[PDB]
Amino acid sequence: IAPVLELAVEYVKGYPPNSPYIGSSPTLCHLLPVKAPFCCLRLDKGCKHNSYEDAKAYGFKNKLIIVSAETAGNGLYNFIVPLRAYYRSRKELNPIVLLLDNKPDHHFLEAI
Amino acid sequence: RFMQFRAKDSYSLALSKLEKRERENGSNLAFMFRLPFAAGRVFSISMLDTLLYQSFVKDYMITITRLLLGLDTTPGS
Amino acid sequence: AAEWISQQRLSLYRRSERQELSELVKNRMKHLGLPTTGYDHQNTLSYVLINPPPDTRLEPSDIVYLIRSDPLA
Ligand SMILES: [K+]
Ligand SMILES: [Zn+2]
C-alpha cells in the first residue's frame, strides 16, 4: 500500500424545488428533468403515461425499498432525501415504495 | 429482543442471560447484545433522548450526529 | 457545472430564515397562481393613554379615540 503524505431516463442534479418545511437543509439530490405528475407516483392505479398496477409491471432493475408508514409527511421526506443525494450512486438507486395507510396529501406529493 | 424471535433457539436465550448479567453491573447498554439490534434491524428513539441528555455535556454531539445523518449540510463536510 | 452548483451551495447555506419564509410564501403563491410580487418588518411600539393630562404633547402617528356625537340627533 502507498504511504500517506503529510501534505497534499437521465437525472439532473439540483436541490428539490419545494422544501416542505422551514429549516429543511437543502441537499443536492438526483432529480427528474421535469416534475412527475401526481398520477405517475402511484403504484396502484394506471395513468395516461403508464398502465402498470404493480411493481413487477414496472420492471425495476435495482431492488426496491419499501416504507410501511401510516401517513406521509416531512418524516418520509427526510427518509427519501438521503437515498437520492447527489453523492449516492445513480446506478445503485433503489426505487422507494411508500406503503401508506392514508392517502398522501398534495403537499407531500409536490415535495417528492 | 422481540424483533426476530426464535423461541426454539439456545443462543437467543443465552443472550438473555448475558443481558441479565450486564444489567446486574448497572449497564445502560443491556439491549446491545441482542441480535436484531447488533445487526441493525431495530433501534429505539430513546437514543435521541440519550443524545439530548449527552448534549448537556457534549454540546457538539447533536451537530455531529446530524452531520453523520446528513440532516445538516455544511459545505466542506 | 461544479462551480455553479458550489456557488448555489454556499448561497443556500448562507441564506437566513427570513429568506426561507419569504421563499416558502412565494412558492405557495406561484403554485396557486397569484403573482409573487406584492408580498414586499414592524419596528414599532404602541400603547394606550387613557385620558392623558391636558398638558400632554401630541406626537406624529398618533390616533385619538373620540366619542363623536350622534349625527342623527
Ligand atoms: K402506475
Ligand atoms: Zn401518469
UniProtKB/Swiss-Prot annotation, chain B:
It is found in: Cell membrane. Changing residue 39 to T: In DEE14; variant homolog in rat has increased channel activity upon positive potentials. Highest expression in liver, brain and spinal cord. Lowest expression in skeletal muscle. Phosphorylated by protein kinase C. Phosphorylation of the C-terminal domain increases channel activity. Homotetramer; which constitutes the Na(+)-activated K(+) channel. Interacts with KCNT2; these heterodimer channels differ from the homomers in their unitary conductance, kinetic behavior, subcellular localization, and response to activation of protein kinase C. Interacts (via C-terminus) with FMR1; this interaction alters gating properties of KCNT1. Interacts with CRBN via its cytoplasmic C-terminus. The cytoplasmic gating ring domain of the closed KCNT1 channel harbors multiple K(+) and Zn(2+) sites, which stabilize the channel in the closed conformation. Under low-Na(+) conditions, the abundant cytoplasmic K(+) ions stabilize the gating ring domain in a closed conformation. KCNT1 contains at least two Na(+)-sensitive sites in the RCKs domain where Na(+) binding induces expansion and rotation of the gating ring that opens the inner gate. Sodium-activated K(+) channel. Acts as an important mediator of neuronal membrane excitability. Contributes to the delayed outward currents. Regulates neuronal bursting in sensory neurons. Contributes to synaptic development and plasticity. It is linked to Developmental and epileptic encephalopathy 14: A rare epileptic encephalopathy of infancy that combines pharmacoresistant seizures with developmental delay. This severe neurologic disorder is characterized by onset in the first 6 months of life of refractory focal seizures and arrest of psychomotor development. Ictal EEG shows discharges that arise randomly from various areas of both hemispheres and migrate from one brain region to another. Epilepsy, nocturnal frontal lobe, 5: An autosomal dominant focal epilepsy syndrome characterized by childhood onset of clusters of motor seizures during sleep. Some patients may develop behavioral or psychiatric manifestations and/or intellectual disability. The phenotype is more severe than observed in other genetic forms of nocturnal frontal lobe epilepsy. Belongs to the potassium channel family. Calcium-activated (TC 1.A.1.3) subfamily. KCa4.1/KCNT1 sub-subfamily. This is Potassium channel subfamily T member 1. It comes from Homo sapiens (Human). The gene is KCNT1. The chain holds residues 909 to 985 of 1230 of the full protein.
